[PDB]
Amino acid sequence: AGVAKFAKYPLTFGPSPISNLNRLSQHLGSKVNVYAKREDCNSGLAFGGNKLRKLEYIVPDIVEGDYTHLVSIGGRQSNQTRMVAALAAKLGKKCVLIQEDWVPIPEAEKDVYNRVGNIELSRIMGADVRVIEDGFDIGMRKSFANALQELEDAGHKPYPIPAGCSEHKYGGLGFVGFADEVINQEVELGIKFDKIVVCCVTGSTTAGILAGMAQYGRQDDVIAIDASFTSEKTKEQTLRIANNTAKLIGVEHEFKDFTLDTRFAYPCYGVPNEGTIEAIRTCAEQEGVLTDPVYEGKSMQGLIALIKEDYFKPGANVLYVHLGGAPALSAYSSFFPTKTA
Amino acid sequence: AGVAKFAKYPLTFGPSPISNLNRLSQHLGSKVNVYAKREDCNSGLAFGGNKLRKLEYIVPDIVEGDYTHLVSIGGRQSNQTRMVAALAAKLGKKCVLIQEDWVPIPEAEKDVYNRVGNIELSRIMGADVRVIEDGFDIGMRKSFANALQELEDAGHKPYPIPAGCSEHKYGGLGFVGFADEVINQEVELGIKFDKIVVCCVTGSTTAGILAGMAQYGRQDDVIAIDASFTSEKTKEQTLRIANNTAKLIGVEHEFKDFTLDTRFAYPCYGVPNEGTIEAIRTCAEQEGVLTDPVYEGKSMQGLIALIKEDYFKPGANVLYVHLGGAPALSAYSSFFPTKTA
Ligand SMILES: *Cc1c(COP(=O)(O)O)cnc(C)c1O
Numbered sequence: 001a002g003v004a005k006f007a008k009y010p011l012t013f014g015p016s017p018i019s020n021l022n023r024l025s026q027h028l029g030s031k032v033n034v035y036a037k038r039e040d041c042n043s044g045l046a047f048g049g050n051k052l053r054k055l056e057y058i059v060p061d062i063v064e065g066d067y068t069h070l071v072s073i074g075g076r077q078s079n080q081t082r083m084v085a086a087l088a089a090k091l092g093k094k095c096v097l098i099q100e101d102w103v104p105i106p107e108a109e110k111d112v113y114n115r116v117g118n119i120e121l122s123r124i125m126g127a128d129v130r131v132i133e134d135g136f137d138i139g140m141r142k143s144f145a146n147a148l149q150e151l152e153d154a155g156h157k158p159y160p161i162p163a164g165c166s167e168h169k170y171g172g173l174g175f176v177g178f179a180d181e182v183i184n185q186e187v188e189l190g191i192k193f194d195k196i197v198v199c200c201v202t203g204s205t206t207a208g209i210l211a212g213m214a215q216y217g218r219q220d221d222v223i224a225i226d227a228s229f230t231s232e233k234t235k236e237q238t239l240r241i242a243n244n245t246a247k248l249i250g251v252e253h254e255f256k257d258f259t260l261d262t263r264f265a266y267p268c269y270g271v272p273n274e275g276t277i278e279a280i281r282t283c284a285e286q287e288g289v290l291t292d293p294v295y296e297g298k299s300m301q302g303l304i305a306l307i308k309e310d311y312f313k314p315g316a317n318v319l320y321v322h323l324g325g326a327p328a329l330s331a332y333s334s335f336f337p338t339k340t341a
Numbered sequence: 342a343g344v345a346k347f348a349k350y351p352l353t354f355g356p357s358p359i360s361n362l363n364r365l366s367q368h369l370g371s372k373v374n375v376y377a378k379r380e381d382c383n384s385g386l387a388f389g390g391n392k393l394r395k396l397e398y399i400v401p402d403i404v405e406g407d408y409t410h411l412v413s414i415g416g417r418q419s420n421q422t423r424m425v426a427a428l429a430a431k432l433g434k435k436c437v438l439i440q441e442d443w444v445p446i447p448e449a450e451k452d453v454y455n456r457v458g459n460i461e462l463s464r465i466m467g468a469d470v471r472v473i474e475d476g477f478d479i480g481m482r483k484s485f486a487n488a489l490q491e492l493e494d495a496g497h498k499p500y501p502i503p504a505g506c507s508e509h510k511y512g513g514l515g516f517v518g519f520a521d522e523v524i525n526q527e528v529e530l531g532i533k534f535d536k537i538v539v540c541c542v543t544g545s546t547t548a549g550i551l552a553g554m555a556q557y558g559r560q561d562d563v564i565a566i567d568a569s570f571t572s573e574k575t576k577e578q579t580l581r582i583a584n585n586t587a588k589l590i591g592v593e594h595e596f597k598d599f600t601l602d603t604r605f606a607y608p609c610y611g612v613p614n615e616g617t618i619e620a621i622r623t624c625a626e627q628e629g630v631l632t633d634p635v636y637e638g639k640s641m642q643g644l645i646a647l648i649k650e651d652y653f654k655p656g657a658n659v660l661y662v663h664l665g666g667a668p669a670l671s672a673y674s675s676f677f678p679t680k681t682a
């Protein structure tokens with residue numbers, strides 16, 4: 001057990017704060033005391049987000065080697081690519097982004113879904129944005145490899161950074177350190193978290209939290225809420241990340257399965273459902289905390305669905321993980337009509 | 342010297358962090374050392390910002406008596422209105438927001454300027470968003486006074502929060518604390534800031550820094566960048582707010598004038614110029630830090646312009662203030678096209 005033996009490059013202000021969503025708690029029945037560890041309030045690098053914690057353990061490599069281009073990938077409103085662009089800017093490197101079509105671009109948004117939001121930010125930061133229309137997949141894509149081959153054949157030295165970092169060698173280390181962090185904040189705040197709720201589609205964030213919590217034998221505190229509607233590969237990939245990461249940090253524990261509620265992924269990746277939107281609104285109306293229609297919105301409804309059904313013990317302290325991703329909210333404007341008054 | 346006598350309700354994580362923009366500073370010929378105090382990363386209340394800091398000294402008054410509605414006013418992509426919603430949602434009060442027509446909505450941005458960005462956020466937080474046609478003015482608005490009367494007629498108890506909280510009785514207290522944070526942070530940093538750059542439209546931000554920095558006899562360290570294009574009143578109100586506040590905290594010194602660079606407001610409030618777009622792109626390409634076409638993109642272009650002309654002593658430590666506004670960026674995608682490689 002030790003993430004400390006790995007090189008880390010600072011890209012955040014330090015330990016992400018924890019918000020006490022006490023008002024939302026009461027509203028939901030006062031059954032559980034909901035808390036939120038603000039990863040969305042990460043750093044000053046283009047709004048921040050969980051993906052920034054992941055990159056901290058990857059940057060040292062980039063810097064140590066002689067690289068000129070940082071290439072990543074993801075869907076249109078990809079949070080990843082947007083943070084890879086901000087990072088590339090900070091390191092003074094070139095940036096290439098492969099924006100594939102992973103979400104059935106809603107009609108009433110087909111004219112902005114590819115111009116406004118996160119994709120706009122990658123542009124403003126000077127990244128070679130490329131709009132391809134390949135299928136959705138949380139695994140290695142055959143457009144990422146070609147981009148690499150291209151820049152290489154061009155005489156450039158590209159740095160591969162897979163979807164959400166997840167499948168990167170050190171993709172699970174950032175959230176191992178997340179675990180060490182919650183453990184300390186529990187003592188500083190004086191509150192123990194009985195459970196941890198976090199969204200999941202490509203893996204690393206969940207896997208990292210599992211392998212990292214294992215350090216204190218608490219992997220079972222984790223509660224993942226699928227948002228990829230493909231629990232199939234999402235659980236198997238998250239599980240494989242959890243193992244390869246546990247090995248890296250000295251954890252013996254072999255992960256064979258984890259809590260992966262799949263009741264709110266539908267209708268698919270990127271497309272909210274009537275429940276998602278209501279969750280976002282309730283969270284926002286009650287706390288002033290925004291959540292997106294793709295990730296955190298679906299994990300927030302799951303958090304509310306669970307609370308409704310007395311899934312947690314009476315008076316439980318549950319740590320909701322806000323991974324950010326709000327900036328893509330402007331590409332789903334059509335789903336939030338003005339509140340009747 | 343007495344901002345402590347007044348009550349304060351916590352709305353931010355704590356004293357804002359100061360980023361060291363060394364890469365940008367090198368880009369601008371290593372003329373000075375640019376630092377940026379991050380008000381744009383000060384809270385979890387939907388992106389937070391400078392207005393939230395102002396509000397901390399106003400919330401106590403609110404909760405004390407009995408008000409049911411918080412009312413404020415600003416343009417379509419207003420930041421203040423959006424932060425008032427979050428404040429209201431959190432305080433569990435209702436929200437009525439007047440969204441005047443303060444900006445000539447670009448032709449390309451006509452089908453979005455009112456459905457995306459800040460406005461969308463206020464709607465998700467269930468605020469009563471009222472899109473009005475009145476024009477730009479940093480002074481008390483008719484639509485405002487009408488709202489107070491309307492709601493008050495319906496048997497409600499609205500709380501009046503003018504534009505940017507600037508004209509509020511305590512709208513200046515906020516940044517008088519910013520001055521305190523600055524001096525303390527110079528100590529913890531082991532360096533002294535020679536000058537402070539900060540955007541200025543409705544007044545209270547700059548006004549509070551002036552009365553605060555004056556506690557130590559350092560008002561002349563303040564350098565405001567106007568983005569209203571109506572210097573005359575912007576300088577008139579800012580100067581009045583700064584004078585009232587000064588008396589509240591006990592500062593005798595009377596402000597008769599202050600540094601207000603107006604070279605970058607052109608062509609008008611809410612609209613960037615090729616220079617702004619250039620600054621936003623420079624800061625983003627160098628630090629991965631995002632600024633807005635309306636306010637900060639101008640404070641930033643001015644900063645760059647001032648450095649070039651050798652306005653500061655060589656090696657000076659210049660504290661730029663990032664007040665936020667980046668969320669409104671989605672309403673200007675037309676201006677930022679994919680850069681060529
Ligand atoms: C990228 C992202 C996720 C998914 O993280 P995984 O580690 O890939 O499960 C969830 N929420 C937000 C806001 C994200 O940006």
Ligand SMILES: *Cc1c(COP(=O)(O)O)cnc(C)c1O
Nearest residue numbers: 420541542543544546636665666
């Ligand atoms: C409100 C605001 C300002 C202006 O503040 P004043 O105190 O009115 O000068 C500047 N920048 C941003 C991003 C703002 O939201």
